[PDB]
Design a protein around this motif. Structure first.
Motif, mmCIF file in Angstrom:
data_model
loop_
_atom_site.group_PDB
_atom_site.id
_atom_site.type_symbol
_atom_site.label_atom_id
_atom_site.label_comp_id
_atom_site.label_asym_id
_atom_site.label_seq_id
_atom_site.Cartn_x
_atom_site.Cartn_y
_atom_site.Cartn_z
ATOM 1 N N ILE A 120 0.942 -1.274 0.091
ATOM 2 C CA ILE A 120 -0.168 0.037 0.110
ATOM 3 C C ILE A 120 0.996 1.201 -0.021
ATOM 4 O O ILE A 120 1.342 1.477 1.177
ATOM 5 N N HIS A 121 1.241 1.740 -1.044
ATOM 6 C CA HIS A 121 1.930 2.922 -1.397
ATOM 7 C C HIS A 121 1.308 4.104 -0.923
ATOM 8 O O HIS A 121 -0.181 4.486 -1.190
ATOM 9 N N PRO A 122 1.971 5.274 -0.753
ATOM 10 C CA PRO A 122 1.046 6.823 -0.459
ATOM 11 C C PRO A 122 0.960 7.270 -1.999
ATOM 12 O O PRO A 122 1.608 6.909 -3.060
ATOM 13 N N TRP A 123 -0.019 8.000 -1.909
ATOM 14 C CA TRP A 123 -0.271 8.701 -3.350
ATOM 15 C C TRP A 123 0.654 9.758 -3.722
ATOM 16 O O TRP A 123 1.442 10.221 -2.763
ATOM 17 N N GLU A 124 1.111 9.905 -4.821
ATOM 18 C CA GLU A 124 2.177 10.892 -5.576
ATOM 19 C C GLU A 124 1.337 11.455 -6.577
ATOM 20 O O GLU A 124 0.558 10.761 -7.362
ATOM 21 N N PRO A 125 1.671 12.721 -6.857
ATOM 22 C CA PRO A 125 1.444 13.540 -8.235
ATOM 23 C C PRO A 125 1.601 12.829 -9.419
ATOM 24 O O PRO A 125 2.947 11.981 -9.628
ATOM 25 N N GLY A 126 1.003 12.585 -10.457
ATOM 26 C CA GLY A 126 1.083 11.556 -11.469
ATOM 27 C C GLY A 126 0.579 10.415 -11.399
ATOM 28 O O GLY A 126 0.853 9.434 -12.234
ATOM 29 N N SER A 127 -0.063 9.817 -10.135
ATOM 30 C CA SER A 127 -0.352 8.551 -9.811
ATOM 31 C C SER A 127 -1.700 8.255 -10.268
ATOM 32 O O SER A 127 -2.650 9.365 -10.192
ATOM 33 N N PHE A 128 -2.128 7.224 -10.948
ATOM 34 C CA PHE A 128 -3.459 6.836 -11.360
ATOM 35 C C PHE A 128 -3.868 5.604 -10.670
ATOM 36 O O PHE A 128 -3.354 4.568 -10.917
ATOM 37 N N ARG A 129 -5.220 5.558 -10.217
ATOM 38 C CA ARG A 129 -5.784 4.452 -9.416
ATOM 39 C C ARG A 129 -6.889 3.788 -10.237
ATOM 40 O O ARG A 129 -7.316 4.415 -11.262
ATOM 41 N N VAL A 130 -7.422 2.652 -9.788
ATOM 42 C CA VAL A 130 -8.531 1.905 -10.376
ATOM 43 C C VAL A 130 -9.912 2.819 -10.123
ATOM 44 O O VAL A 130 -9.945 3.631 -9.327
ATOM 45 N N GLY A 131 -10.578 2.423 -10.874
ATOM 46 C CA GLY A 131 -12.168 2.599 -10.915
ATOM 47 C C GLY A 131 -12.959 1.572 -10.755
ATOM 48 O O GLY A 131 -12.505 0.558 -10.244
ATOM 49 N N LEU A 132 -14.416 1.713 -10.800
ATOM 50 C CA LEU A 132 -15.139 0.648 -10.572
ATOM 51 C C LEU A 132 -16.124 0.358 -11.832
ATOM 52 O O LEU A 132 -15.925 0.801 -12.730
ATOM 53 N N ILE A 133 -16.995 -0.649 -11.455
ATOM 54 C CA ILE A 133 -17.939 -0.959 -12.442
ATOM 55 C C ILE A 133 -19.402 -0.805 -11.459
ATOM 56 O O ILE A 133 -19.372 -1.553 -10.434
ATOM 57 N N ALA A 134 -20.188 -0.020 -11.569
ATOM 58 C CA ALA A 134 -21.377 0.169 -11.043
ATOM 59 C C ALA A 134 -22.647 -0.110 -11.815
ATOM 60 O O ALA A 134 -22.717 -0.477 -13.196
ATOM 61 N N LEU A 135 -23.909 -0.188 -11.228
ATOM 62 C CA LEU A 135 -24.983 -0.405 -11.907
ATOM 63 C C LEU A 135 -25.901 0.894 -11.785
ATOM 64 O O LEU A 135 -25.972 1.521 -10.664
ATOM 65 N N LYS A 136 -26.556 1.440 -12.825
ATOM 66 C CA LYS A 136 -27.172 2.718 -12.927
ATOM 67 C C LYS A 136 -28.598 2.264 -12.455
ATOM 68 O O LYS A 136 -29.459 1.614 -12.852
ATOM 69 N N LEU A 137 -28.844 2.681 -11.150
ATOM 70 C CA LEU A 137 -30.123 2.532 -10.378
ATOM 71 C C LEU A 137 -31.308 3.506 -10.776
ATOM 72 O O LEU A 137 -32.437 3.028 -10.956
ATOM 73 N N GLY A 138 -30.931 4.695 -11.251
ATOM 74 C CA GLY A 138 -31.917 5.678 -11.521
ATOM 75 C C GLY A 138 -31.517 6.942 -11.111
ATOM 76 O O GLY A 138 -30.422 7.226 -10.974
ATOM 77 N N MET A 139 -32.407 7.824 -11.095
ATOM 78 C CA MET A 139 -32.279 9.220 -10.887
ATOM 79 C C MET A 139 -33.249 10.018 -9.918
ATOM 80 O O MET A 139 -33.944 9.138 -9.734
ATOM 81 N N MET A 140 -32.638 10.773 -9.199
ATOM 82 C CA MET A 140 -33.199 11.371 -7.947
ATOM 83 C C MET A 140 -32.723 12.904 -7.857
ATOM 84 O O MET A 140 -31.658 13.369 -8.505
ATOM 85 N N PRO A 141 -33.499 13.684 -7.504
ATOM 86 C CA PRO A 141 -33.363 15.143 -7.275
ATOM 87 C C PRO A 141 -32.463 15.380 -5.886
ATOM 88 O O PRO A 141 -32.593 14.415 -4.888
ATOM 89 N N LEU A 142 -31.554 16.338 -5.728
ATOM 90 C CA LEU A 142 -31.215 16.786 -4.498
ATOM 91 C C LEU A 142 -30.986 18.115 -4.731
ATOM 92 O O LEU A 142 -30.772 18.812 -5.771
ATOM 93 N N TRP A 143 -30.932 18.957 -3.424
ATOM 94 C CA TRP A 143 -30.824 20.555 -3.437
ATOM 95 C C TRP A 143 -29.523 20.783 -2.604
ATOM 96 O O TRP A 143 -29.064 20.053 -1.657
ATOM 97 N N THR A 144 -29.004 21.814 -3.194
ATOM 98 C CA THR A 144 -27.913 22.556 -2.290
ATOM 99 C C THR A 144 -28.466 23.697 -1.626
ATOM 100 O O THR A 144 -29.363 24.298 -1.867
#
Ligand SMILES: [K+]
Ligand SMILES: [K+]
Ligand SMILES: [Mg+2]
Ligand SMILES: [Mg+2]
Ligand SMILES: [Mg+2]
Ligand SMILES: [Mg+2]
Ligand SMILES: [Mg+2]
Ligand SMILES: [Mg+2]
Ligand SMILES: [Mg+2]
Ligand SMILES: [Mg+2]
Ligand SMILES: [Mg+2]
Ligand SMILES: [Mg+2]
Ligand SMILES: [Mg+2]
Ligand SMILES: [Mg+2]
Ligand SMILES: [Mg+2]
Ligand SMILES: [Mg+2]
Ligand SMILES: [Mg+2]
Ligand SMILES: [Mg+2]
Ligand SMILES: [Mg+2]
Lengths: 110, 219, 154, 115, 305
Positions: free
Chosen positions: E44-68
């Motif tokens: 487990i290395h520390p983060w460094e500039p120029g470093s690229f990590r993995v992403g995910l696979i997710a399932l699209k559940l749907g859409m929803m509102p939120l407010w700021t």
RNA sequence: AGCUACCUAAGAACAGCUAAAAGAGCACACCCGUCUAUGUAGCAAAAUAGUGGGAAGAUUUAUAGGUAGAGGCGACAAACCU
RNA sequence: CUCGAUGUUGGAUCAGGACAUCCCGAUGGUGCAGCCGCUAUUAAAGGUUCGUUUGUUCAACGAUUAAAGUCCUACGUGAUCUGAGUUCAGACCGGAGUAAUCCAGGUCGGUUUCUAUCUACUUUCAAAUUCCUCCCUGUACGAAAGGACAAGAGAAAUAAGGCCUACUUCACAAAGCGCCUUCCCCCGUAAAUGAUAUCAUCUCAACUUAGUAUACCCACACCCACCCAAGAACAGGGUUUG
């Protein structure tokens, strides 16, 4: 639009005999274990279905003879009895259809 | 038991987890803001935070003519005539800027949408902005106001006499002739009433929704 | 684009589709077993299940009587629905019919089905059956299952 | 909501806007790139055979949620400076216009009712 | 030589038993992977500039509102992380590209419907098969041991992500729907010409240029939406709330990756690196992580003043 | 001259509504063919759908007969005469 | 070259190209204070409005616009459309002819066929443009009048690409009128050091400066059947919903 030129038999043989136009061999054919005739796996046996249909037609001709007119469907269940059979305890109060032959081995008395 | 209509989702292929998660946010916001029972035809007063209003608070009173949407986006439309100018606002039930929703008068009408009031005489859309709330007795049936409104002359914003609209609260006898009514029946679809496969039975959906509502209030 | 469109386009239009499905359903109620083109039987099957549920509401239910009166074009079948078919399925909650593909129609080669109300008095259809538990494969699996049961107890 | 040829209702008390005329006031330009006017946009009118700038203060087309929708397309006559031509606006106007106090201070000053 | 499917020859008794057997095995293979840090993880290395990590696979559940807090409404898309695991590591040398790759897998599907070579791969990994597998270019310091679970809290609110999926398939379409061509007038003489392309080239060239816009199959292709802000992470259900809309239909699988837009370069200093390990985390995260600007559901009503 | 132009003999049809002097109006049957779309080896060597003009009249129409090519016939369009 | 036919002015649709640049970029000059101009060098990635009028191209006019570019493409494109015009048969006016007829003189009316054999092409391609406001600032610049700029921050429009929570048309869905996302470059010159030509000289001298991608995709059953947000067929996804 009309053809500018006749298409040669060599061009037409490459189109007509293309594997896309050829009939495909079926691999879902099998023997019906009951009768020995051929059938597709997901389709009922043609022979066994016909046998069942011929007797259903005979029973339906009997139902016709009893009802004796249109719009006379009864309000009770029906039972089909064959020569040498009698209404059981659970067949009381049912319309009985009598068939003048022996019960087929495949149409079990349930 | 009254379940507010935005809790019953529309038919579709949405994964039920999504409606569960959404219901949890609708129920949390309902702890902060009391959302009362109302129908199309009820008189409501909505108070909302407005950064540009005087005092930074707005109040609108009107008759609910539409309730639509599902989930946290669900809305209703209030309509009123103010200085003889027709006005209507579509409010978001769960918008956090809504401070209060008050049921001035709780009642039901002969139709599930009152959009035809846009073509009715102005009186049927005019309600006093300072009218005092009518008390609703406990364990009493919701009243159904059976007012059949009188209409303005045609053309209307929609063809309200067509069977697809199925409107019962219009005095069609006054505004339409028998020949005009006979033409509209050409769009009638009598078989539609009997298409059993079109029926959307949500009884079992509501039962599970009530278990979630009771569970949230229990803890 | 026909995403999520759950009904077929048949007959001469929407009223015509219903009238086709109604005529088929009426025949199924009289004869308990009909054959017809496969897609129409597939489309009609949903309604045949719904008709039983209305019959289970009883003939004193005004809505169910109004529904049955629309869907059964021969009126002697309305008493049959409420007094024969529905009492037959009072124990079941669904699955009142079974539908099976039969060989294509001779004339136009149409894909065909046979559909029937379960529990009818007709000779049984030659249904498909799973392999006997006694086959070589199913005996190896049976052994596997019981071996697990033994270790599960431990 | 408001485009070329839309007939508008002048809701301020200008004499130009309330004098009877054989031709209803008609938008002939929208001072927006896409050409579709909304509340707070300026338009040019052909009114009483003249050309006068106006401000849109209401329309029948649905806007975003929480915003009023009016039964008529309402305008207020303005000068090329932005100053109102009239002195009283009785009909309610959206509070959202109070976001543009910079450009429309004088027009908001003659507004009696807000919605 | 005839075809066979998994339950063709099984008996009425063995079909339920086999289903329970395969399901139980899968559930326990997934349960065996819930503690990656006790199973000899990679460094487990520390983060460094120029470093690229993995992403995910997710399932699209749907859409929803939120407010700021500002009162602005934003719509968001709920992306559920369903059984995401690392499957393969390919060294920078063997990848034939400038980066190492990390193959990730999404949704558990049936072992009965997958090819044997794929079944052979998952048997060696010790996981049920995944519906979708995607390749992520990583830097050497971001490698993860295959079999490691990935979660929604790999991402954090305030971050931006690129989401890639296949768009909704619309089938064969005409130029109006496909390309926005205007078509032709409805009346005023038009003969059988209302939705047609018009001219497709000039007379001189005697041909149609490659790339000419014509009727054809529309949609059902991989698009990416760049730079979507993560508003909220629900760690209990593994839901990501990404700003706006993402390609594809609900219940489809999407590739979620740290946004490659330049503004968002080197914002991973405070993101989990190489990934989030809930088993290692000392203090459990709350059920919901929120971006600071989000009006939370139980928060008091907005009151501009 | 079994089509069509015109004519002869002797027939036939024209609902309802309004107005009531009727080459009046509205409007069917019926006659025609304004405009649009369709069709263009068609359903059709001129059609179909809608929309139209007229519809007790210089109307429409069945029957038999007459006028014949250097000609007929023509409310002249050089129309029509299989 | 084509009269055993290469039919169609203007418009619609879709636009390919040139650059002699209308706008946006970078420069030099100025009778360039500033704001605007004018003139030249460079730049073709991106853009280049809607109406009234005329069959019109052309023009005039009303509103705009950063700008409303010039051109070529069989006066691009009619087996994609239109047919106002144009130009056959009918007719009218004026004129010409004894008359039949005639008149780039007006006027009204006047059939736009084609089932695609071949070539070509049918998801190039995920990097984006512009305006406006605030601000810098009433600052620089000017006697005043006036009055900015490589920044900084916003908010838009258009163009691409998606999507459906809400609204809307609607209603197991498809849509826009709704929402979301959008990321490099460009060269003209201006200057150092410096020889031929011991000063100078930015240099077709050697030389030093301004000043040179990533992302996506990616493993392979049965190929019975069923289902599908996948689809003309085929293909694809799911079935641990046979
Ligand atoms: K020629
Ligand atoms: K023609
Ligand atoms: Mg005038
Ligand atoms: Mg159009
Ligand atoms: Mg035609
Ligand atoms: Mg058409
Ligand atoms: Mg008449
Ligand atoms: Mg005559
Ligand atoms: Mg003449
Ligand atoms: Mg002549
Ligand atoms: Mg030739
Ligand atoms: Mg072009
Ligand atoms: Mg040309
Ligand atoms: Mg001729
Ligand atoms: Mg004269
Ligand atoms: Mg003359
Ligand atoms: Mg004419
Ligand atoms: Mg003409
Ligand atoms: Mg063609």
């Amino acid at each position: 639009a009309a053809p500018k030129n006749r298409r040669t038999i060599e061009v037409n043989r490459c189109r007509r005999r293309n594997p896309q136009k050829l009939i495909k061999v079926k691999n879902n054919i099998d023997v019906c274990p009951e009768c020995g005739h051929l059938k597709q796996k997901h389709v009922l046996c043609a022979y066994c279905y016909e046998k069942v249909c011929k007797e259903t037609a005979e029973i339906r001709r009997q139902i016709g003879k009893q009802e004796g007119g249109p719009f006379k469907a009864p309000t009770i269940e029906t039972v089909v009895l064959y020569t040498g059979e009698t209404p059981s305890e659970q067949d009381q109060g049912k319309r009985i259809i009598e068939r003048d032959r022996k019960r087929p081995s495949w149409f079990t008395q349930n | 038991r009254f379940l507010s209509p935005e809790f019953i989702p529309r038919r579709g292929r949405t994964d039920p987890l999504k409606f569960q998660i959404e219901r949890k946010d609708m129920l949390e916001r309902r702890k902060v803001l009391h959302i009362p029972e109302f129908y199309v035809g009820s008189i409501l007063r909505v108070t909302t935070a407005d950064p540009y209003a005087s005092g930074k608070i707005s109040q609108f009173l009107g008759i609910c003519i539409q309730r639509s949407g599902r989930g946290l986006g669900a809305t209703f439309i209030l309509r009123n005539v103010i200085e003889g100018q027709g006005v209507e606002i579509c409010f978001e039930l769960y918008n956090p800027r809504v401070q209060e929703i008050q049921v001035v008068k709780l009642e039901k009408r002969l139709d599930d949408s009152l959009l035809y009031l846009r073509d009715a005489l102005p009186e049927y859309s005019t309600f006093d902005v300072n009218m005092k709330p009518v008390v609703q007795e406990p364990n009493q049936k919701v009243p159904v106001n059976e007012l059949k409104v009188k209409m303005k002359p045609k053309p209307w914003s929609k063809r309200w006499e067509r069977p697809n609209f199925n409107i019962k609260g219009i005095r069609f006898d006054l505004c339409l002739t028998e020949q005009q009514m006979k033409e509209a029946q050409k769009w009638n679809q009598p078989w539609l009433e009997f298409d059993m496969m079109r029926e959307y039975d949500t009884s079992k959906i509501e039962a599970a929704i009530w278990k979630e509502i009771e569970a949230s209030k229990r803890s | 684009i026909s995403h999520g469109r759950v009904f077929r386009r048949m007959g001469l239009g929407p009223e015509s589709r219903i009238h086709l499905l109604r005529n088929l359903l009426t025949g199924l109620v009289r004869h308990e077993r009909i054959e017809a083109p496969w897609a129409r039987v597939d489309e009609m099957r949903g309604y045949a299940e719904k008709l039983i549920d209305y019959g289970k509401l009883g003939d004193t239910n005004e809505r169910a009587m109004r529904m049955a009166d629309f869907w059964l074009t021969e009126k002697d079948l309305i008493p049959k629905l409420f007094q024969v078919l529905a009492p037959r399925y009072k124990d079941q909650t669904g699955g009142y019919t079974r539908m099976l593909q039969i060989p294509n129609r001779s004339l136009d080669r149409a894909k065909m089905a046979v559909i029937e109300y379960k529990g009818n008095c007709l000779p049984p259809l030659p249904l498909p059956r799973r392999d006997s538990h006694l086959t070589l494969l199913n005996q190896l699996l049976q052994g596997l299952r019981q071996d697990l049961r033994q270790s599960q107890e431990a | 909501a408001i485009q070329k040829m839309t007939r508008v209702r002048v809701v301020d008390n200008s004499a130009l806007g309330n004098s009877p005329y054989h031709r209803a006031p008609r938008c002939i330009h929208v001072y927006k790139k896409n050409g579709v006017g909304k509340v707070g946009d300026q338009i040019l009118l052909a009114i009483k055979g003249q050309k006068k700038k106006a401000l849109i203060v209401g329309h029948c087309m649905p806007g975003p949620r929480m915003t009023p929708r009016f039964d008529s397309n309402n305008v207020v006559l303005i000068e090329d400076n932005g100053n109102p031509v009239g002195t009283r606006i009785k009909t309610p106007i959206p509070t959202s216009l109070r976001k543009r106090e910079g450009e429309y201070s004088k027009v908001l000053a003659i507004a009696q009712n807000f919605v | 030589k005839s075809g066979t499917w998994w339950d063709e020859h099984l008996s009425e008794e063995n079909v339920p038993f086999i289903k329970q057997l395969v399901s139980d095995e899968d559930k326990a293979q997934l349960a065996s992977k819930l503690c990656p840090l006790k199973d000899e993880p990679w460094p487990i290395h520390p983060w460094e500039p120029g470093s690229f990590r993995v992403g995910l696979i997710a399932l699209k559940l749907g859409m929803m509102p939120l407010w700021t807090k500002d009162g602005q409404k934003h719509v968001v898309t709920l992306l559920q992380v369903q059984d995401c695991h690392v499957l393969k590591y390919t060294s920078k040398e063997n990848c034939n590209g400038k980066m190492a790759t990390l193959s990730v897998g999404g949704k558990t599907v049936s072992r009965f419907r997958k090819a044997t070579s794929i079944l052979e791969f998952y048997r060696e990994l010790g996981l049920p098969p995944k519906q979708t597998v995607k390749i992520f270019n990583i830097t050497d310091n971001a490698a993860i041991k295959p079999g490691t679970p990935l979660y929604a809290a790999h991402f954090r609110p305030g971050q931006y992500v690129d989401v890639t999926a296949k768009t909704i398939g619309k089938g064969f379409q005409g130029v109006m729907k496909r390309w926005g061509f205007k078509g032709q007038p409805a009346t005023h003489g038009q003969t059988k010409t209302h939705r047609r392309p018009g001219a497709v080239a000039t007379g001189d060239i005697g041909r149609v240029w490659p790339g000419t816009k014509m009727p054809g199959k529309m949609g059902n292709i991989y698009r990416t939406e760049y730079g979507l802000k993560v508003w909220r992470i629900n760690t209990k259900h593994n839901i990501i709330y990404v700003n706006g809309s993402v390609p594809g239909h609900k219940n489809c699988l999407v590739k979620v990756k740290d946004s490659k837009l330049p503004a968002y370069k080197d914002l991973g200093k405070n993101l989990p690196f190489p990934t989030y390990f809930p088993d290692g985390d000392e203090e459990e995260l709350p059920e919901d992580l929120y971006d600071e600007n989000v009006c939370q559901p139980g928060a008091p009503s907005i009151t501009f003043a």
